[PDB]
Design a protein around this ligand. Structure first.
Ligand SMILES: C/N=C(\NC)Nc1ccc(N2CCC[C@H]2C(=O)NCc2ccc3[nH]c(-c4cnnn4C)nc3c2)cc1
Length: 105
């Protein structure tokens, strides 16, 4: 399971999930609601997947955790127009994450 040294990542992820702009990213992009997603996006990622991976030991390092966080935002930029509601949410969440990551590095 998660090593205590990564508790700061657990907290960042919890705070991301609670953010007003997090709604598009809480769970895997749902084919029932969004069509053609995996056609374009080779490596989907979302906050619930990260939460489970972190909590069960699937991130050995903060760098691996951060790479999945950035993948959420990179996928969002790939799939969505910048002026769409989801596109805007991705930019908000990237800024929020990078701010929190800056406090530590
Ligand atoms: C400001 N709204 C909220 N604040 C808390 N909550 C909220 C949630 C759902 C709904 N509705 C209302 C009708 C049904 C549901 C709906 O359409 N859900 C679609 C949905 C859900 C997640 C997504 N994630 C990406 C995505 C990610 N990356 N690319 N995309 C295209 N699309 C998504 C589409 C109404 C309000």
């Amino acid at each position: 399971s998660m090593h205590s040294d990564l508790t700061f990542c657990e907290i960042i992820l919890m705070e991301m999930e609670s953010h007003d702009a997090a709604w598009p990213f809480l769970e895997p992009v749902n084919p029932r609601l969004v069509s053609g997603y995996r056609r374009i996006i080779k490596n989907p990622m979302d906050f619930s997947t990260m939460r489970h991976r972190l909590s069960r030991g699937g991130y050995t390092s903060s760098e691996e955790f951060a790479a999945d966080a950035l993948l959420v935002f990179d996928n969002c930029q790939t799939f969505n127009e910048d002026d769409s509601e989801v596109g805007k949410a991705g930019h908000i969440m990237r800024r929020f994450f990078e701010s929190r990551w800056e406090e530590f590095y």
